[PDB]
Write a protein that binds this ligand. Structure first.
Ligand SMILES: CCOC(=O)c1c(-c2ccccc2)oc2ccc(O)c(CN3CCCC3)c12
Length: 268
């Protein structure tokens, strides 16, 4: 289904599992280096891509989380889109009376300026995209009227259909990566009253900034302060793309290992 077992929990008992959520355009295999930097016998399960708005995705994840972990305690972690997903699940779990003890955002940083969801923005985005298409491929008027009334999924299907009028593996990977990135853009963040740990790199990587220049700037709280009063930021430096890998992930893992140790002691 959509649950990957990175490290299975014992048949009974054992430590609290870490649930990780996939990043934009990738799977949860990317959390293996993190897993290497967490305490021994820490179980880990990864939740992979599902369809819908952030809230719709969480509506699919949360029942599964509960089936696997019951009342809690819940440790929810994510890099890239995975961060927003972990957070949405945190809100859903807390609303149903569950015990969420840790939410780990791994450089899941909001654009430094809000990205509006307006028809003007739709037009600016696709104008930007058309221009790069011209330059990258050495190659007309953009049918804005039809695009404005399509959602993101509809917009890319329209552009891809108009394009064919490229092999499927490549189209599918560009498609889901594009939609997962837009899901980050259009996420409507709700407030959460539990503790959030935000691991913060210095900047988005250049390719990220080229697609959406508002990611060139980040606030110090990464845009989460207004939604999260109990917010901790753990600066890790480097770029967004590097935050998930060795050696920077060692810094994340060392800190996160301390948090897990406290959760384990409290149960004891
Ligand atoms: C090379 C990295 O490309 C992307 O980040 C994005 C992609 C993408 C497309 C095809 C293949 C891979 C990625 O689509 C986007 C749509 C909106 C948007 O704001 C972003 C920018 N990101 C950066 C921070 C979150 C949004 C992207």
């Amino acid at each position: 289904g959509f649950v990957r077992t990175l490290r299975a929990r014992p048949e009974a008992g054992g430590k609290v599992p870490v649930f990780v959520f996939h990043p934009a355009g990738g799977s949860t295999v990317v959390y293996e280096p993190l897993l290497g930097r967490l305490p021994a016998d820490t179980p880990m399960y990864g939740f992979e891509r599902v369809e819908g708005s952030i809230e719709e995705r969480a509506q699919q994840y949360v029942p599964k989380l509960i089936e696997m972990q019951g009342d809690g305690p819940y440790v929810l972690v994510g890099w890239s889109l995975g961060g927003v997903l972990a957070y949405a699940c945190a809100i859903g779990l807390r609303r149903l009376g569950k015990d969420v003890r840790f939410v780990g955002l791994i450089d899941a940083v909001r654009a430094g300026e809000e990205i509006p969801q307006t028809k003007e923005e739709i037009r600016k985005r696709w104008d930007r995209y058309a221009a790069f298409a011209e330059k990258t491929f050495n190659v007309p008027a953009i049918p804005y009227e039809q695009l404005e009334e399509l959602d993101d999924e509809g917009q890319v299907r329209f552009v891809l259909d108009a394009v064919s009028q490229i092999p499927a593996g490549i189209i599918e990977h560009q498609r889901t990566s594009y939609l997962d990135n837009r899901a980050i853009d259009t996420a409507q963040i709700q407030p959460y009253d539990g503790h959030v740990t935000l691991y913060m790199a210095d900047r988005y990587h250049d390719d990220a900034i080229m697609f959406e220049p508002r990611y060139a700037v980040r606030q110090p709280d990464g845009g989460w302060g207004e939604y999260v009063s109990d917010l901790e930021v753990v600066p890790i430096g480097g770029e967004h793309i590097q935050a998930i890998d060795e050696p920077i992930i060692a810094k994340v893992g060392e800190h996160m290992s301390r948090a897990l140790g406290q959760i384990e002691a409290d149960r004891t």
